[PDB]
Write an enzyme that holds these catalytic residues in place. Structure first.
Site, PDB file in Angstrom:
ATOM      1  N   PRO A  10     -21.392  21.843 -57.778  1.00 35.66           N
ATOM      2  CA  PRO A  10     -22.333  21.829 -56.663  1.00 35.66           C
ATOM      3  C   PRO A  10     -23.470  20.813 -56.878  1.00 35.66           C
ATOM      4  O   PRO A  10     -23.900  20.128 -55.956  1.00 35.66           O
ATOM      5  CB  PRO A  10     -22.887  23.235 -56.567  1.00 35.66           C
ATOM      6  CG  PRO A  10     -21.773  24.126 -57.122  1.00 35.66           C
ATOM      7  CD  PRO A  10     -21.289  23.181 -58.319  1.00 35.66           C
ATOM      8  N   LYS A  12     -23.572  17.916 -58.755  1.00 39.37           N
ATOM      9  CA  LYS A  12     -23.111  16.548 -58.563  1.00 39.37           C
ATOM     10  C   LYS A  12     -22.960  16.218 -57.078  1.00 39.37           C
ATOM     11  O   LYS A  12     -23.283  15.109 -56.646  1.00 39.37           O
ATOM     12  CB  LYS A  12     -21.769  16.342 -59.268  1.00 39.37           C
ATOM     13  CG  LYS A  12     -21.826  16.417 -60.784  1.00 39.37           C
ATOM     14  CD  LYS A  12     -20.433  16.281 -61.360  1.00 39.37           C
ATOM     15  CE  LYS A  12     -20.429  16.218 -62.878  1.00 39.37           C
ATOM     16  NZ  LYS A  12     -19.037  15.973 -63.395  1.00 39.37           N
ATOM     17  N   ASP A  65     -17.322  11.863 -63.844  1.00 39.24           N
ATOM     18  CA  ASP A  65     -17.330  12.536 -65.125  1.00 39.24           C
ATOM     19  C   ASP A  65     -18.590  12.053 -65.813  1.00 39.24           C
ATOM     20  O   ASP A  65     -18.959  10.878 -65.714  1.00 39.24           O
ATOM     21  CB  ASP A  65     -16.096  12.203 -65.964  1.00 39.24           C
ATOM     22  CG  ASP A  65     -15.927  13.153 -67.153  1.00 39.24           C
ATOM     23  OD1 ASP A  65     -16.228  14.357 -67.012  1.00 39.24           O
ATOM     24  OD2 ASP A  65     -15.482  12.705 -68.230  1.00 39.24           O
ATOM     25  N   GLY A 141     -27.061  22.042 -65.602  1.00 37.11           N
ATOM     26  CA  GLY A 141     -26.681  21.813 -66.984  1.00 37.11           C
ATOM     27  C   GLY A 141     -27.816  21.572 -67.966  1.00 37.11           C
ATOM     28  O   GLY A 141     -28.680  22.437 -68.156  1.00 37.11           O
ATOM     29  N   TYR A 142     -27.807  20.388 -68.585  1.00 39.44           N
ATOM     30  CA  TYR A 142     -28.806  19.994 -69.587  1.00 39.44           C
ATOM     31  C   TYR A 142     -30.071  19.334 -69.055  1.00 39.44           C
ATOM     32  O   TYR A 142     -30.888  18.862 -69.831  1.00 39.44           O
ATOM     33  CB  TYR A 142     -28.169  19.059 -70.612  1.00 39.44           C
ATOM     34  CG  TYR A 142     -27.043  19.683 -71.388  1.00 39.44           C
ATOM     35  CD1 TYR A 142     -27.287  20.676 -72.334  1.00 39.44           C
ATOM     36  CD2 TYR A 142     -25.726  19.277 -71.180  1.00 39.44           C
ATOM     37  CE1 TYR A 142     -26.243  21.251 -73.058  1.00 39.44           C
ATOM     38  CE2 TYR A 142     -24.678  19.839 -71.894  1.00 39.44           C
ATOM     39  CZ  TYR A 142     -24.940  20.822 -72.832  1.00 39.44           C
ATOM     40  OH  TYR A 142     -23.897  21.355 -73.554  1.00 39.44           O
ATOM     41  N   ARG A 169     -26.344   9.074 -63.306  1.00 39.57           N
ATOM     42  CA  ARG A 169     -25.568   9.173 -62.081  1.00 39.57           C
ATOM     43  C   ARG A 169     -26.188   8.336 -60.970  1.00 39.57           C
ATOM     44  O   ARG A 169     -25.478   7.856 -60.086  1.00 39.57           O
ATOM     45  CB  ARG A 169     -25.450  10.633 -61.635  1.00 39.57           C
ATOM     46  CG  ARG A 169     -24.601  10.825 -60.383  1.00 39.57           C
ATOM     47  CD  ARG A 169     -24.264  12.294 -60.141  1.00 39.57           C
ATOM     48  NE  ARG A 169     -23.648  12.896 -61.319  1.00 39.57           N
ATOM     49  CZ  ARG A 169     -24.314  13.608 -62.221  1.00 39.57           C
ATOM     50  NH1 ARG A 169     -25.616  13.818 -62.065  1.00 39.57           N
ATOM     51  NH2 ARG A 169     -23.692  14.070 -63.301  1.00 39.57           N
TER      52      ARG A 169
HETATM   53 MN   LIG Z   1     -15.413  16.501 -67.336  1.00 41.56          MN
END
Ligand SMILES: [Mn+2]
Ligand SMILES: [Mn+2]
Lengths: 184, 184
Positions: A10, A12, A65, A141-142, A169
């Site tokens: 979600p 990204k 990724d 995440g981080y 990103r």
């Molecule tokens: Mn991956």
């Protein structure tokens, strides 16, 4: 134009749709599972993922990724950032870095885009340090423990706009956009 | 009979050739790279690996995948035990488990065997605890800090014979052998 983003993350999707939306590009998420191979570079994961996906999802499509590579931990968790976050979490990282001299690290993102039988990749990198405590509620995440070199806020303490401006990103996206402008 | 073991891990080859040698089976290692997908279970890695390998290596062949799953760390490092060992190493594990109440964990091994157009799998599990300090010079990877439930020695303090007798790989091998006896 419409681009299908094959992902189940979600976070990204928010950063991507938002950034590309600015330029009148429609991003539609599509959760379709694909194999992410174990590898040393994100680029290999993207290549294999796109190879497997072509013909099984609508075009044109993209996948991404990314990972956090921490110097003191030899690039770890890197490619497996997702798995590591889910198991040992931020606490697990901070514990591994208690009394770590250099907390230098970088975030990397790779975007794979498929269209007209061909695949193209775009990447962006952003260095920073691992904070000593979590901070912020935005992102994922981080983000709560990563302070991009050039500021004092963590990715989590920034808005989507503020992140896409410094983030790894964010750069992959700018690169990917430059390409679109010149080809389509 | 001759079985080609597709792997680049010297340790796994020693334990396997040794065990199966006892029964007059010839194991010949063949380093041929294949994709190991990111997954939650070793079984998925083996299935995909064999699917990709068939037709590219001599038959019959086998491949193996294994990992250490630590309870306090939510099964981590599990499927990515190799990567984690290479980056944060045993120190990295011990640090993550300083003052960990329960140091319970298990080793799992999955063997995939291909022959006559069909694939078969065999697995073995072995629980134990994570020692507080390394111990032993035999084995490989996490053997120096894993004490299998039912003894006080680590996998590293045992000979190849002693390990194949308690190990997770030892059970997969016994299972795999039972099958051979009944089919070939
Ligand atoms: Mn991956
Ligand atoms: Mn593996």
């Amino acid at each position: 134009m419409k681009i299908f983003f094959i992902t189940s993350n979600p976070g990204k999707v928010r950063e991507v749709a938002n950034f590309l939306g600015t330029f009148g590009i429609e991003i539609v998420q599509l959760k379709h599972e694909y194999p992410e191979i174990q590898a040393e570079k994100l680029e290999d994961v993207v290549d294999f993922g796109i190879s497997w996906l072509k013909g099984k999802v609508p075009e044109p499509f993209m996948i991404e990724d990314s990972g956090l590579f921490i110097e003191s931990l030899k690039g770890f968790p890197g490619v497996y950032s997702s798995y590591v976050y889910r198991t040992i979490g931020l606490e697990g990282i901070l514990k591994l870095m208690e009394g770590a001299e250099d907390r230098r690290a970088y975030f990397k993102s790779v975007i794979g885009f498929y269209i007209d039988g061909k695949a193209y990749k775009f990447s962006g990198v952003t260095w920073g340090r691992i904070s000593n405590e979590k901070r912020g509620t935005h992102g994922f995440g981080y983000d709560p423990i990563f302070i991009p070199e050039g500021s004092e806020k963590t990715f989590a303490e920034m808005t989507i706009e503020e992140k896409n401006a410094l983030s790894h990103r964010g750069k992959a996206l700018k690169a990917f956009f430059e390409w679109l402008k010149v080809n389509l």
